[PDB]
Design a protein around this nucleic acid. Structure first.
Lengths: 52, 85
DNA sequence: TATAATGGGCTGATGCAGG
């Protein structure tokens, strides 16, 4: 996980970070013998593209 | 001995090969319509270059005599198509 | 045209890979 922009506000002896954070969440998919993966390693996909 | 040289397929390799064969025939049917040519003739021209020029002959039923002249001309129209074709 | 099936039942003349 990583932080792009950081905006900070100060109040009392505390600071509050509104973090513009950027990360990747993994999901595993199981392939079985009669299916073929039609996507290469490291391809970029939008919502709704076909993987296998 | 010579058939013992080919390993036998696994269930996935079998379905992979079967897969590509059928999709390949669907390929050639649509290439008949784009092209205005004849599926059988396209089938043999595709056929020619996979095997090598070792085998090139007249195939019964095709309208053109199948010699390196026509398979070059027909192949280069095939390759003269847009990238999506 | 569709379960799956995947490797057989005696002599002489001459031209050769080898001590």
């Amino acid at each position: 996980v990583r932080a792009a922009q950081v905006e900070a506000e100060e109040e009392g002896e505390t600071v509050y970070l509104t973090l513009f954070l950027e990360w990747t969440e993994p999901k595993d998919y199981r392939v079985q013998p009669h299916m073929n993966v039609v996507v290469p390693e490291g391809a970029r996909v939008e919502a709704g593209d076909k993987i296998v | 001995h010579e058939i013992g040289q080919v390993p036998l397929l696994t269930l996935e390799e079998e379905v992979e090969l079967a897969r590509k064969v059928e999709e390949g025939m669907e390929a050639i049917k649509k290439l008949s319509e784009i092209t205005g040519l004849d599926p059988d003739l396209i089938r043999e021209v595709v056929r020619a270059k996979i095997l090598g020029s070792a085998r090139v002959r007249h195939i019964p039923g095709l309208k053109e005599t199948l010699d390196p002249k026509t398979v070059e001309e027909i192949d280069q129209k095939l390759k003269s198509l847009p990238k999506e074709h």
